[PDB]
Amino acid sequence: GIDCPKCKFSYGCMHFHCTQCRHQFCSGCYNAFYAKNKCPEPNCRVKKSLHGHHPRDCLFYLRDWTALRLQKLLQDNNVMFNTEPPAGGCRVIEQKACGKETPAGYAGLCQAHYKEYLVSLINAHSLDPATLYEVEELETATERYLHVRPQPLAGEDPPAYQARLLQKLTEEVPLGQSIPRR
Numbered sequence: 612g613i614d615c616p617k618c619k620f621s622y623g624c625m626h627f628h629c630t631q632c633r634h635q636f637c638s639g640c641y642n643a644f645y646a647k648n649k650c651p652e653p654n655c656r657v658k659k660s661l662h663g664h665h666p667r668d669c670l671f672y673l674r675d676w677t678a679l680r681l682q683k684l685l686q687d688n689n690v691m692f693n694t695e696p697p698a699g700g701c702r703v704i705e706q707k708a709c710g711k712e713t714p715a716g717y718a719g720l721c722q723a724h725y726k727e728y729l730v731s732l733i734n735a736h737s738l739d740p741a742t743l744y745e746v747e748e749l750e751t752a753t754e755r756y757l758h759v760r761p762q763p764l765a766g767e768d769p770p771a772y773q774a775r776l777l778q779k780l781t782e783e784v785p786l787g788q789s790i791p792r793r
């Protein structure tokens with residue numbers, strides 16, 4: 612299940628409570644959640660919201676991708692993923708079974724739980740979503756994680772600019788370090 616990164620107790624919303632230690636954290640990347648006015652991070656722009664600071668491969672972000680784009684990341688890396696239901700209506704047990712509609716090609720899960728499954732594979736294989744980023748996404752990631760505003764250099768054509776952004780991001784900003792890897 613999910614372990615409190617603080618106490619280590621084992622168990623579509625990312626905000627998780629551990630009742631033992633009262634830690635607030637993200638169930639996708641295990642980074643801490645902060646209530647409004649409680650965030651200590653100097654370069655964070657969100658000071659009046661309940662939030663955490665997530666790596667680019669947290670489900671917090673990747674849940675907003677389409678299933679098709681999540682599949683594309685897996686396909687580009689030749690990681691297999693299920694599309695068909697199991698041998699014998701979403702079975703995933705939620706805290707209120709999920710019971711939602713089970714679309715064709717979504718492996719017998721609802722849309723949200725199928726994306727969670729794809730992200731679980733993406734994370735297991737340490738696939739980097741930045742490899743599919745358009746330049747706008749690379750610029751956003753640069754601002755978010757490197758705290759600088761990117762801009763192309765004189766003499767840099769568009770492919771070179773995009774490649775530079777991608778190279779600096781991947782070299783200097785690790786994927787989530789508390790996300791479980793295989």
Ligand SMILES: COc1ccccc1C(=O)CCc1ccccc1C(=O)O
Pocket residue numbers: 623624625626661662
């Ligand atoms: C799926 O749930 C959400 C998705 C996007 C934004 C907000 C929510 C929620 O209100 C529930 C989950 C949640 C609660 C508090 C803080 C963050 C989140 C979250 O998952 O983003």
Ligand SMILES: [Zn+2]
Pocket residue numbers: 615616617618619620629630631632633634
């Ligand atoms: Zn705990």
Ligand SMILES: [Zn+2]
Pocket residue numbers: 625637638639640641642663664665666669670671
């Ligand atoms: Zn997260």
Ligand SMILES: [Zn+2]
Pocket residue numbers: 645650651652655656657658662663664
């Ligand atoms: Zn913050």
Ligand SMILES: [Zn+2]
Pocket residue numbers: 701702703709710711720721722723724
């Ligand atoms: Zn479901």
